């Protein structure tokens, strides 16, 4: 429930391809000494034991309201029926390990049946691997 902010994204599956658009995020949590963060988004299909599926947006420095406007494509295989699209926002740090900011996920089979679109509530790191929470209300 902790206020980690929100992210706007689209995710849909067409002809065995998963297309994801990471638009923007709002009200992220300060994670740097200067009171801001340097956010980027990591996308993966999990589980990913070999660590082969990772894609990420650019890092946007010094903001809590990043606008990435980036799109990504994943080629799907039959085994992806048991997988989830994981979306994690991280804070890039120059002098320390990067900080986790917030996350969420979508089942691949669930996206096939209905694309994701709109604002989603950011969850904690464990939480985010399991579900998502749309915020259609505002």
Curated annotation (Swiss-Prot):
Ca(2+) 3 binds at residues 93, 97, 99. It is found in: Cytoplasm; Cell membrane; Mitochondrion membrane; Nucleus. Ca(2+) 1 binds at residues 31-32, 91, 93, 99. A 1,2-diacyl-sn-glycero-3-phospho-(1D-myo-inositol-4,5-bisphosphate) binds at residues 40, 90. Residues 3-120 form the C2 domain. Ca(2+) 2 binds at residues 32, 38, 91-93. The modification Phosphoserine is found at residue 71. Calcium-activated, phospholipid- and diacylglycerol (DAG)-dependent serine/threonine-protein kinase that is involved in positive and negative regulation of cell proliferation, apoptosis, differentiation, migration and adhesion, cardiac hypertrophy, angiogenesis, platelet function and inflammation, by directly phosphorylating targets such as RAF1, BCL2, CSPG4, TNNT2/CTNT, or activating signaling cascades involving MAPK1/3 (ERK1/2) and RAP1GAP. Depending on the cell type, is involved in cell proliferation and cell growth arrest by positive and negative regulation of the cell cycle. Interacts with ADAP1/CENTA1, CSPG4 and PRKCABP. Binds to CAVIN2 in the presence of phosphatidylserine. Interacts with PICK1 (via PDZ domain). Interacts with TRIM41. Recruited in a circadian manner into a nuclear complex which also includes BMAL1 and RACK1. Interacts with PARD3. Interacts with SOCS2. Belongs to the protein kinase superfamily. AGC Ser/Thr protein kinase family. PKC subfamily. This is Protein kinase C alpha type. It comes from Rattus norvegicus. The gene is Prkca. The chain holds residues 156 to 293 of 672 of the full protein.
């Amino acid at each position: 429930t902790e206020k980690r902010g929100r992210i706007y994204l689209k995710a849909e599956v067409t002809d065995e391809k998963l297309h994801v658009t990471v638009r923007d995020a709002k009200n992220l949590i300060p994670m740097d000494p200067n009171g801001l963060s340097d956010p980027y988004v990591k996308l993966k299909l999990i589980p990913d034991p070999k660590n082969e599926s990772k894609q990420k947006t650019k890092t946007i420095r010094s903001t809590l309201n990043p606008q990435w406007n980036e799109s990504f494509t994943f080629k799907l295989k039959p085994s992806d029926k048991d997988r989830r699209l994981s979306v994690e926002i991280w804070d890039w740090d120059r002098t320390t390990r990067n900080d986790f900011m917030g996350s969420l996920s979508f089942g691949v089979s669930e996206l096939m049946k209905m694309p994701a679109s709109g604002w989603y509530k950011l969850l904690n790191q464990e939480e985010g691997e399991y579900y998502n929470v749309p915020i259609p209300e505002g």
